Design a binder for this molecule. Structure first.
Ligand SMILES: [Mg+2]
Ligand SMILES: [Mg+2]
Ligand SMILES: [Mg+2]
Ligand SMILES: [Mg+2]
Ligand SMILES: [Mg+2]
Ligand SMILES: [Mg+2]
Ligand SMILES: [Mg+2]
Lengths: 58, 141, 262, 185, 131
RNA sequence: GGUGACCACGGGUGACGGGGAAUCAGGGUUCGAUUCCGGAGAGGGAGCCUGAGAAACGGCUACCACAUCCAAGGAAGGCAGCAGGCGCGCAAAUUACCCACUCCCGACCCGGGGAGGUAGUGACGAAAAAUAACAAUACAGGACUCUUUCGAGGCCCUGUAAUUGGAAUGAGUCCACUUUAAAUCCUUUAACGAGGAUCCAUUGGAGGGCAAGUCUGGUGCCAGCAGCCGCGGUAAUUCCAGCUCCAA
């Protein structure tokens, strides 16, 4: 073997450790379906944008 | 053309089963040579003992070292190469451990740019490699 | 197996016993007796699932031991005695008398009968033969055999038999235009009149029977059992009169019965 | 050996293709409109309709005046008008093929209690039913998917034990009441 | 006690066991499943009998309270009650005692009497030392 | 003489047969060790006693292979029964309670039954179904309405943050009842039990197939991802993370 295995786990070692921010508990079940049904169906947006996607990075 | 007589059923079925040997899937699953040549012997998984840690070169359009382990199956004592499918799970692997190796994905065929490797490691030292990767549980130190 | 079987799985029990799937794994497994186990009712089911007198197996054990159950004029202590067809189940302590006759759907039904109509019983002669010293014998559909019968009785006829004596009170000849009852197969439990008896040498005879409503059906000779002289039945027929009705008309019969009772 | 039953069957069928924008929105319309927990129960009612459509279609190919077509024809028509998705006068095998899933969904107890006005919302209805508050006839029912029949439709009402029919208020009302009397003479 | 009523149905008499059989449904509107003793004494008053021969069992409470359905057994005499009744119900009412040992020891005693032949002194003395 | 290209004979089977299971236009293709019926076997063969019924093995005799005790002279074995161990493995449960039910056996209403029933382990799998509902404030939105954009409310639905803000509930503790052979569980029904109602839903993805980011920070043909196309050699929509979305 070439013995190039010394670099295993390189990038994951280098990556800075940023902790997850605490967030409100996400509604689950029928309520989660309620939220997404209300979000995408019963709403009118006057702003244009040619129907941009749910994860718009504008 | 094909025969269409009322009492040609014997010819139709005999011709069918003779021609069924000409596609790889039927030949493979009914000849038995593939079953004998399979290191796993028709099993979904297999335990084995890590014989060494080796690195495999990628194909031409790629350029990387794939960290695999040479493993001897506890049954039948066959030596196979099993890929380690994570970023730093080779360090989680040491010498002479039980590893649950599984098929890589497409039925004894090489996957991706890894040449000649058809198996990947699932568990080591009877603890899952995913659990070790995600930190759910640590090595039995 | 290496010998006789003495178990009967619940699933493998005859359908007309009308047993469920959850109480247990086994079935009464009736003892040997005058009737075959496929077309017999063990006393255990008759006093537990028919009349609901007993709740469990040991409860019907106590009632049989106390000796009020009297089949065909004799007290029977066997919990799994094979009752059979048109046998008189007399329970004198309660004063009720039952004649075991198939209903319209080929199932044995509770047929309460009068005490004086329980003193006799019909029977189908199966084999006729002469014994030693030239004595003619006669075996019926039951395992009951009698000697010295009237020389006019042939095979597959019906003999009027009275209980407590075993003699032949009278007999019914097998002939065209006689009322009968089917005792086996799809047409089991259908009351009708013989119309035609076609015969096949070396094989089973086929008879054609027409009921009161005019429906014509056929069956094998071994499933015939003449219970009437021409038109008049000699026994009190059960509710439904042994008439077969298709899926169309019991449904509207429920609706009419429900509507009247509603 | 054992006296079990092991007679079970799945009540739903997953879609053949995943990730259609058209199918995902259509099911999400129904789930939000009728207040359903997940897509399994919209698949369940869809499977129920498909079984009915399959049975009705088989009878239609069957020759007319066939006893089976006649007997089973009114058999399935009888129960379709009993639950209420089919009109009383719409008693034809053809009209069954025209049925949808909305009618099979509005016969649900969660939908009927909302429509009866007992519940302020379809989603209030599910939590109200689940909280052992509503009753049909003299029986309390805590299942939202309880399909109601035309006869049982009128009887739907609050349970006597609930803090909406008879007395016996909830614990939070009692704890609030006991705290109020404990805070003063 | 204020609102507890007893109803009977499927009533039928069978002098086969000198008893009358019925299935009873209780109506405890806001109360737990009423104890069998109270049903026994009320069912006795409905049928004018002493509340020591009445037998009741199989009480299942319906969903949401209220109705509970049970099976009712009555007899013309306590003598007959001791005669033809399952022993658990007699033990439930205290008229039969099952002050015995566990089945595992009984099997061991039987096997240990199988090892010793004939001699009554040792056949009855097989279970003394290995207590 | 008999059988054979209408496939005899021989060989293989990872072959116990069938009822049936999976898939489901129609036709079919696989699967049936496995609860019902039939067969076979009891470590491998072989031979027998008794009996109506056995070539029986929770019967005997012998040999072979294992294996137990011994004072070494002998003696005793058969869990492919229920449990429970070892081994084999990718792979499979408690050395529990009871004859209460279903039936079986017996001289028999009375005895016995690891048959069988009950409980324990059990994310094989299947059915139902929690993780929230509502109201009033703020700010948008609506075919909104009132003067004909401007402002308000005689209306409706979402959303973000709030001393809101007091109503409903189970999951949990726990009384009794009930269930039961005795229990347990379930159903009943007391007293507690929800504002991060922190009583905290996860598993996989976000280039395409295929729903979802041309966000931010690292790494720099390395680590790695990637079922297939492909991404990464310093501005990565694809790796490692955060955030945010997507599917169940
Ligand atoms: Mg085999
Ligand atoms: Mg099989
Ligand atoms: Mg054998
Ligand atoms: Mg004998
Ligand atoms: Mg043998
Ligand atoms: Mg939770
Ligand atoms: Mg990412």
């Amino acid at each position: 073997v070439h013995g190039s295995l010394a670099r295993a786990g390189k990038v994951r070692g280098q990556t800075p450790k940023v902790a997850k921010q605490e967030k409100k508990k996400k509604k689950t079940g029928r309520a989660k379906r309620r939220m997404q049904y209300n979000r995408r169906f019963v709403n009118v947006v006057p702003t244009f944008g040619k129907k941009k996607g749910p994860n718009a990075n504008s | 053309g094909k025969c269409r007589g009322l009492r040609t059923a014997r010819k139709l079925r005999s011709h069918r089963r003779d021609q069924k040997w000409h596609d790889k899937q039927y030949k493979k699953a009914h000849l038995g040579t593939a079953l004998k040549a399979n290191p796993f012997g028709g099993a979904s998984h297999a335990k084995g003992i890590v014989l060494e840690k080796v690195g495999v070169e990628a194909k031409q359009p790629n350029s990387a070292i794939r960290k695999c382990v040479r493993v001897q199956l506890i049954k039948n004592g066959k030596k196979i190469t099993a890929f380690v499918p994570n970023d730093g799970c080779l360090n989680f692997i040491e010498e002479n451990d039980e590893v649950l190796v599984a098929g890589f994905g497409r039925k004894g065929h090489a996957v991706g740019d890894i040449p000649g490797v058809r198996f990947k490691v699932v568990k080591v030292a009877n603890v899952s490699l995913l659990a070790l990767y995600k930190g759910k549980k640590e090595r039995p130190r | 197996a290496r010998g006789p079987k003495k178990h009967l799985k619940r699933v493998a029990a005859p359908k007309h016993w009308m047993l469920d799937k959850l109480t247990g794994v086994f079935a009464p497994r009736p003892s040997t007796g005058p009737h075959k186990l496929r077309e017999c009712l063990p006393l255990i089911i008759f006093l537990r699932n028919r009349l609901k007198y007993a709740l469990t197996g040991d409860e019907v054990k106590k009632i049989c031991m106390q000796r009020f159950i009297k089949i065909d004029g004799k007290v029977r202590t066997d919990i799994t005695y094979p009752a059979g067809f048109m046998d008189v189940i007399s329970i004198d302590k309660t004063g009720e008398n039952f004649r075991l006759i198939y209903d319209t759907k080929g199932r044995f039904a509770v047929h309460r009968i009068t005490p004086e109509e329980a003193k006799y019983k019909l029977c189908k002669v199966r084999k006729i033969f002469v014994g030693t010293k030239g004595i003619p014998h006669l075996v019926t559909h039951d395992a009951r055999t009698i000697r010295y019968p009237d020389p006019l009785i042939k095979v597959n006829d019906t003999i009027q038999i009275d209980l407590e004596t075993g003699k032949i009170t009278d007999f019914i000849k097998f002939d065209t235009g006689n009322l009968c009852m089917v005792t086996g197969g799809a047409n089991l439990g259908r009351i009708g009149v013989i119309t035609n008896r076609e015969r096949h040498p070396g094989s089973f005879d086929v008879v054609h029977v027409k009921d009161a409503n005019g429906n014509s059906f056929a069956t094998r000779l071994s499933n015939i059992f003449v219970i009437g002289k021409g038109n008049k039945p000699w026994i009190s027929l059960p509710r439904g009169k042994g008439i077969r009705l298709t899926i169309a008309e019991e449904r509207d019969k429920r609706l009419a019965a429900k509507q009247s009772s509603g | 050996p054992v006296a079990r039953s092991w007679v079970c069957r799945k009540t739903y069928v997953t879609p053949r293709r995943p990730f259609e924008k058209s199918r995902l929105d259509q099911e999400l319309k129904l789930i939000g409109e009728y207040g359903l927990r997940n897509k399994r129960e919209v698949w369940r009612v869809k499977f129920t309709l498909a079984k009915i459509r399959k049975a009705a279609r088989e009878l239609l190919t069957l020759d007319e005046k066939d006893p089976r077509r006649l007997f089973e024809g009114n058999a399935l028509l009888r129960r379709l008008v009993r639950i209420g998705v089919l009109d009383e006068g719409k008693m034809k095998l053809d009209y069954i093929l025209g049925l949808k899933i909305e009618d099979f969904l509005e016969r649900r107890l969660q939908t009927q209690v909302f429509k009866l006005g007992l519940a302020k919302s379809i989603h209030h209805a599910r939590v109200l039913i689940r909280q052992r508050h509503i009753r049909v006839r003299k029986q309390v029912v805590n299942i939202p998917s309880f399909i109601v029949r035309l006869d049982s439709q009128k009887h739907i009402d609050f349970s006597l034990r609930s803090p909406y029919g008879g007395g016996r208020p909830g614990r939070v009302k009692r704890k609030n009441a006991k705290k109020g009397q404990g805070g003063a003479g | 006690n204020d609102t507890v009523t007893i109803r009977t149905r499927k009533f039928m008499t069978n002098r086969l066991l000198q008893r009358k059989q019925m299935v009873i449904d209780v109506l405890h509107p806001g109360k737990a499943t009423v104890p069998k003793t109270e049903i026994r004494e009320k069912l006795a008053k409905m049928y004018k009998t002493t509340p020591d021969v009445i037998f009741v069992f199989g009480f299942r409470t319906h969903f949401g309270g209220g109705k509970t359905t049970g099976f009712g057994m009555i007899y013309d005499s306590l003598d007959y009650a001791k005669k033809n009744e399952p022993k658990h119900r007699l033990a439930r009412h205290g008229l039969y005692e099952k002050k015995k040992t566990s089945r595992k020891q009984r099997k061991e005693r039987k096997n240990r009497m199988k090892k010793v032949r004939g001699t009554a002194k040792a056949n009855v003395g097989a279970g003394k030392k290995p207590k």
